[PDB]
């Protein structure tokens, strides 16, 4: 369907506009590679990991695939996700409420 990078720049592009701080902390596969995104909350002092999954009729929707205040954990599985898949993409937005930015629905 949409090209990673594609999905990757509106992402960024939307939370730059919401007065997010967004980087590329990894680059993967420009057509295919799946994306883990980062959202950090810079007020609460906390921070969330994103990964993709899909419904049982192939709707697209964010999980957490691990969960900790303490941030350290989540870079640590973000390290050990690009060595399971060497396509990965990983986005870091760091912003005063803690927004993620994303479209999709996504898993509390």
Known sequence: LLS???WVAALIRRA???GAFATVAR???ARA???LVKAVDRREG???LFSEATRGDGERFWMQPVRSTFEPDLDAYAERAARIDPDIWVVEIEDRDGRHFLTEPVES
Request: charged share 35%; hydrophobic share 35%.
């Open 4 to 6: 990673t990078d594609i």
């Open 16 to 18: 730059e506009l919401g």
């Open 27 to 29: 680059k993967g596969d």
């Open 33 to 35: 590679g799946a994306v």
């Open 46 to 48: 906390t921070a969330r």
